[PDB]
Design a binder for this molecule. Structure first.
Ligand SMILES: Nc1ncnc2c1ncn2[C@@H]1O[C@H](COP(=O)(O)OP(=O)(O)NP(=O)(O)O)[C@@H](O)[C@H]1O
Lengths: 338, 94, 861
């Protein structure tokens, strides 16, 4: 049965908030996969066991879509909690943005449309993805996006219902969350508007504002007020159609936003001029051609990841020294298997 | 109050060994309080032993904390950081 | 102390400047000739004439959208998203004329309108019903009420079978005669109804969903709009009562799907063609998202296209019943970010300039600068440049300004994301725009970009950004010789001469490497701007002497000039340098980074930036949160940022010779003092004095040298201005340094703690900004001592007395919450300050007891 001894650990390819991603190989069947590690000692809250349990339920509901990632194996050995998942051959979209800085409109349109199909699949099934992020978006070897951390999602949402928990990464939280409103999947379309600006401009629209440096600038108390109260401005170099998409998702009122209507919303996303160029049926299929194909160097494309990770040492961190008295050794069972 | 604890200058590389939190305390007179929470390994607070993750802090350097926020008390301890005194309530540790 | 302090300082706020944030309601009164604006924050401001302002702010800070004036009377009605309505009343408090709340109303909600001569108000709700109120005493009249069943009793033959009448909407007032009200129901049904006889005078049919009604002063015809892009025009006479089909009904933009029309005004009864003005109606398939007002007269239709959402609009016209003309002189429109007014006398309908309520925000405000006691020669040169770069009537002209003519010409000047500097009349009650300099003209562009709707673009507000690194990071101005320094996000720094003549010249550009001898970390961030080569035409006004550039194009966190010496200093996230503009060679450059780093040499997006967590009951999941406690260290933060750049003539080497010196200051708590050798074939040389290293490593925020009389060193070229400015030299100087958590002063030939004060030890605090100021006494102003004012991270201002470092006062100027307001501050040299309570508005505070300001107005009620 599944357990840590069978998979050999090649290199760390991502350090996240609460998790370590390793490239891992098998010999019994010769294939290679990513494996994400959570620390059972870290997920010790009642809310922590809920978010890590519900993360299994999102893979359970996301059983097949081309733009998500599938749970291929799961195991819970030695104070660690393992999800084995499709290896992304092309890195995250954030590293691609470091290399490129700015995407031309032909490149940026493709990624936002594929991310819209992925987002709509979660919403339609009953999931709010809650944490769209420029590094949660990933590339295949052919460049198609995958959307890939399911930790903070809202499970089981009925169409037209809402949630009240405060959640998501600070640069991408939607205004209705910070107000304390009850919110629907309008928040995921807000986070797409932010990410589209970051692709096309090369900078956050909700950056730390272009005034001169001060402490209490890198605080979320500053950023949350910047996103609530400040106006947002599009670079005047952008095509008029691209500006209109960004404005229409960037609307601070969820009822006004492009895509946020409780029935016809995605049909407006299909009908908007920027999107009018692209065939949504061919875009779910193999048949659309991506504009950029990521690296084929190294044994497995290890170069695509951050130097901070692709030079890290390979062990699980050496031991639970003294922590070994405190740790859990059974409670997370039942979400151990596919 | 039970005791006021000297936390020393390190004279060396070793940090002071704490993280602190907000919370609440009571006698029926429920009120906000600031607490010790993580005695981090290899920091000089661990050399003193009278501290615990259980404990409320009542004064910093002989000034009463009672009205301050947690963001104000980490200010009152990022400076003021070469010659700490902290005053703590429970004598019985219960 | 025995209260001697009270002659020097006491704390006040003054009324704000610039356009209001989140506008929401409007009113205008043709008989007082005053305008009012209501706002989502619950504010009720009034803007009657040049230098006239008033401001209400309700008991409850709820959003509003309805306002009406009692035309010619001291009172106004304002409607909240709540059930409540309440009456605002204006009173001539003997000096300080002001608006205050009279009475409150409640019901067990949607629109209100008022009547002249037959003095009555009428309200409409979300249920299909109308109610009447005598504004003299806030209650309904219990008999004058109009339920859906009563208005249904009339029923046309299609509606006889149905009771499902839609929401009440668009109550419209009377039309010369005193007793008729016009009523809309969103279903599409329209009625005219009599108060004095409690009956329908006419019905008007309608079938599609409604959203406008209008009256014409001669009631021969009336116009209405529908929430589908249509409008119904109708005529009226005593035989027309069955109203079978509309008279001129149309949709103004073709066969297409064309949105909704949310308001119409009718001005047809004048001489000439049929003036109609309407909001919305644009074809949704091609012009859907944008915000526009269409004006029609005869064959001339234009659409006015605005850079922000339309709130409301009004036309300048006469309410005198004996008049026969609709007299549309000018049209005024409230956008979400600007108020515009346009005059319709000549074809193409020109925009009208505004004396007040300017859109300060029109490019985002990146910095605040202030200069005080400005020379009349400079001010005349600046306004001459302003007027050289820049029927004509202003309609809103009601009440009168009672305040004094300026006895102290203060200038506040501001830098913007567009790379532009704006100059503003900070003296007295309100700002006025003087001049606008564009730095952007120097730099090449790295990137680059009637029909069916008859479009013309209007309003000064711009919703686009030109370039992220044209933005002005710091400004400083040298009054006494008309030179200015401006510093930008890509390491650019310009020094400019004021030259009130148009001329063509090529700048000299220099570049300085902060890490010249230090090994190169790899800068992958902002690529540097390229200045356009060869000669360039420049306007009469500020013109660049020279450009200086930094090797890493980081934000220029500090800049200063000392014009007598002809030096400028500039400082970044990574290092600082000195430059002499007289002979173009750089004086020095120095790197002050730690030999390894994190928050440097990077693009605008990065993985490493961790955001310090909130402590609110908003912003976290429901309840403890961790903060650590730790002594500061040499790599704990972006430690190479340069905060101070200061010039002084002071005894640093030895007590005999008064040598000219420059002081850097850094996030590390390193204070590199330098001695300088100014010549009068040769150029300025610089050598390091004593590096002062702080005991707590907290960032230095300000440095000031106290002359041995306890008075700060003067401003640079002040030898042209006074005798009294001439400093002590016989007593040895002390240097005052402000760190983010404590203040110290030191004796310059031997740095030793003369005085010290530690704020944060006594109470949890931090210092954001510091400046030194003088406090002339309210009487016997001969007593005019000096103090430093410091801005707390909690928004409090504290005043400290130099050299003694004793806290004189403890005042709650700004709240904890508005961190962007705290970060925006500038201090005037007389204990007064400006801060941005909105990106749209400056608020002003004064802590000097002698320098104070109040509302001071009168009006013919
Ligand atoms: N399947 C994968 N293939 C390749 N790289 C991956 C894969 N899954 C995650 N990564 C990388 O690992 C990083 C962090 O993994 P992630 O699953 O997002 O951890 P996390 O803690 O949930 N991150 P975060 O979203 O920031 O909280 C990502 O940003 C990617 O760079």
């Amino acid at each position: 049965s599944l357990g840590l001894q069978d998979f050999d650990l090649l290199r760390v390819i991502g350090r996240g908030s609460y998790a370590k991603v390793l490239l891992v190989r098998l010999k019994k069947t010769d294939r290679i996969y990513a494996m994400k590690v959570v620390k059972k000692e870290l997920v010790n809250d009642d809310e922590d066991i809920d978010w890590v349990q519900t993360e299994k339920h999102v893979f359970e509901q996301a059983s097949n879509h081309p733009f998500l990632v599938g749970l291929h194996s799961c195991f819970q050995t030695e104070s660690r909690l393992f999800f084995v998942i499709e290896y992304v051959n092309g890195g995250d979209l954030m590293f691609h943005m470091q290399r490129q800085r700015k995407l031309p409109e032909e490149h940026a349109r493709f990624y936002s449309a594929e991310i819209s199909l992925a987002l709509n699949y979660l919403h339609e099934r009953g999931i709010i993805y809650r944490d769209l992020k420029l590094d949660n978006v990933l590339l295949d070897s052919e460049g198609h996006i995958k959307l890939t951390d399911y930790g903070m999602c809202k499970e089981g949402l009925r169409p037209g219902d809402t949630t009240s928990t405060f959640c998501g990464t600070p640069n991408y939280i939607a205004p209705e969350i910070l107000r304390g409103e009850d919110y629907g999947f309008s928040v995921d379309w807000w986070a797409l508007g932010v990410l589209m600006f970051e692709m096309m401009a090369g900078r956050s629209p909700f950056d730390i504002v272009g005034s001169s440096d001060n402490p209490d600038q890198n605080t979320e108390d500053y950023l949350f007020q910047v996103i609530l109260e400040k106006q947002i401005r599009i670079p005047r170099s952008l095509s008029v159609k691209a500006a209109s998409v960004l404005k229409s998702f960037l609307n601070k009122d969820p009822k006004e936003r492009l895509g946020c209507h409780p029935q016809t919303g995605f049909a407006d996303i299909q009908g908007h001029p920027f999107f009018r160029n692209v065939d949504w049926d061919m875009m779910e299929q193999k048949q659309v051609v991506p504009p950029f194909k990521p690296n084929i160097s190294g044994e497995f494309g290890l170069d695509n990841f951050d130097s901070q990770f692709t030079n890290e040492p390979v062990q699980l961190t050496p031991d639970d020294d003294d922590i070994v008295r405190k740790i859990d050794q059974s409670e997370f069972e039942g979400f151990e298997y596919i | 109050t039970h005791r006021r604890v000297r936390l020393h200058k390190h004279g060396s590389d070793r940090p002071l060994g704490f993280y602190i939190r907000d919370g609440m305390s009571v006698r029926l007179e429920r009120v906000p309080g600031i607490f010790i929470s993580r005695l981090v390994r290899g920091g000089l607070a661990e050399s003193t032993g009278l501290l615990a993750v259980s404990d409320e802090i009542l004064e910093v350097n002989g000034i009463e904390v009672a009205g301050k926020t947690l963001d104000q008390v980490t200010d009152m301890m990022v400076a003021n950081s070469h010659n700490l005194i902290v005053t703590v309530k429970p004598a019985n540790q219960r | 102390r025995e209260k001697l302090k009270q002659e020097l300082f006491a704390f006040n706020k003054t009324v704000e400047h610039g356009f209001p944030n989140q506008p929401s309601a409007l009113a205008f009164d043709p008989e007082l000739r005053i305008m009012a604006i209501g706002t989502r924050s619950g504010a009720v401001k009034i803007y009657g004439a040049p230098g006239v302002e008033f401001t209400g702010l309700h008991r409850d800070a709820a959003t509003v959208t309805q306002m009406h004036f009692l035309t010619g009377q001291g009172r106004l009605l304002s409607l909240l998203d709540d059930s409540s309505l309440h009456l605002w009343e204006i009173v001539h408090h003997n000096g300080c004329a002001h608006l205050e709340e009279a009475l409150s109303f409640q019901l067990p909600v949607t629109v209100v309108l008022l009547v002249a001569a037959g003095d009555i108000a009428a309200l409409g709700t979300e249920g299909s019903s109308v109610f009447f109120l005598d504004v003299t005493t806030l209650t309904l009249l219990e008999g004058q009420t109009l339920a859906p069943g009563e208005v249904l009793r009339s029923v046309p033959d299609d509606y006889r079978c149905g009771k499902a009448l839609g929401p009440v909407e668009s109550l419209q007032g009377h039309l010369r005669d005193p007793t008729k009200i016009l009523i809309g129901y969103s279903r599409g049904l329209l009625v005219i109804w009599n108060q004095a006889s409690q009956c329908v005078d006419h019905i008007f049919l309608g079938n599609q969903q409604l959203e406008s009604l209008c009256w014409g002063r001669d009631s021969s015809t009336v116009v209405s709009s529908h929430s589908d892009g249509s409008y119904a025009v109708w005529s009226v006479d005593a035989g027309s009562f069955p109203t079978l089909q509309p008279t001129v009904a149309t949709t103004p933009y073709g066969p297409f799907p064309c949105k909704a029309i949310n308001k119409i005004l009718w001005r047809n009864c004048e001489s000439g063609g049929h003036f109609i003005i309407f909001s919305g109606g644009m074809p949704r398939a091609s012009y859907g998202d944008r915000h526009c007002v269409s004006v029609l007269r005869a064959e001339t239709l234009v659409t006015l296209d605005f850079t922000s959402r339309i709130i409301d609009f009004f036309t300048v016209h006469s309410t005198r019943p004996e008049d026969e003309f609709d007299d549309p002189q000018a049209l005024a429109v409230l956008l979400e970010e600007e108020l515009v007014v346009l005059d319709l006398q000549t074809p193409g309908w020109p925009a009208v300039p505004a004396p007040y309520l300017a859109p300060l925000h029109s490019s985002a405000i990146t910095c605040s600068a202030h200069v005080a006691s400005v020379p009349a020669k400079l001010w005349a040169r600046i306004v001459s440049a302003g007027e050289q770069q820049s029927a004509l009537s202003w309609p809103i002209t009601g009440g009168r300004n009672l305040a004094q003519e300026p006895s102290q010409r203060g200038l506040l000047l501001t830098g913007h994301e567009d790379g532009t500097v704006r100059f503003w009349d900070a003296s007295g009650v309100a700002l006025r725009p003087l001049y606008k300099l564009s730095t952007a003209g120097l730099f090449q562009t790295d990137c680059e970009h009637d029909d069916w709707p008859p479009f013309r673009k209007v309003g000064c507000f711009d919703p686009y950004s030109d370039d992220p690194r044209l933005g002005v990071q710091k400004v400083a101005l040298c009054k006494y010789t008309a030179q200015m320094v401006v510093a930008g996000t890509a390491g650019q720094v310009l020094v400019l001469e004021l030259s009130d003549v148009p001329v063509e010249q090529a700048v000299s550009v220099a570049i300085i490497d902060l890490l010249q001898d230090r090994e190169g970390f790899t800068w992958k961030g902002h690529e540097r701007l390229s200045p356009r080569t060869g000669p360039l035409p420049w306007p009469a006004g500020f013109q660049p002497r020279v450009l200086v550039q930094c090797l890493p194009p980081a934000a220029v966190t500090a800049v200063t000039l000392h014009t007598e010496w002809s030096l400028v200093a500039f400082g970044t996230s990574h290092g600082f340098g000195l430059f002499d503009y007289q002979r173009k060679s750089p004086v020095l450059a120095r790197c002050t980074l730690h030999p390894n780093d994190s928050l440097a040499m990077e693009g605008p997006l990065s993985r490493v930036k961790s955001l310090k967590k909130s402590l609110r009951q908003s912003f976290r999941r429901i309840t403890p949160v961790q903060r650590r406690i730790e002594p500061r260290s040499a790599d704990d933060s972006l430690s190479g940022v340069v905060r101070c750049l200061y010039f002084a003539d002071t005894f640093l080497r030895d007590g005999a010779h008064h040598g000219p010196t420059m002081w850097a200051g850094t996030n590390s708590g390193s204070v590199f003092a330098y001695a300088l050798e100014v010549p009068a074939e040769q150029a300025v040389e610089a050598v390091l004095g004593k590096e002062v290293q702080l005991m707590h490593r907290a960032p230095v925020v300000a440095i000031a040298v106290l002359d041995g009389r306890g008075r700060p060193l003067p401003e640079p070229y002040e030898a042209s201005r006074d005798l009294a400015q001439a400093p002590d030299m016989q007593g040895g100087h002390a240097v005052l340094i402000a760190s983010e958590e404590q203040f110290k002063v030191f004796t310059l030939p031997k740095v030793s703690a003369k005085t010290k004060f530690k704020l944060t030890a006594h109470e949890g605090c931090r210092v954001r900004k510091v400046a030194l100021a003088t406090f002339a006494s309210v009487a016997c102003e001969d007593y005019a001592e000096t103090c430093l004012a410091c801005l707390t991270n909690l928004g409090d201002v504290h005043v400290f007395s130099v050299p003694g470092l004793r806290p004189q006062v403890h005042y709650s100027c700004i709240r904890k919450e508005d961190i962007s307001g705290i970060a925006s501050c500038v201090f005037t040299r007389h204990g007064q300050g400006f801060y941005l309570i909105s990106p749209s508005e400056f608020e002003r505070f004064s802590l000097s007891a002698r320098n104070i300001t109040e509302p001071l107005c009168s009006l013919d009620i």
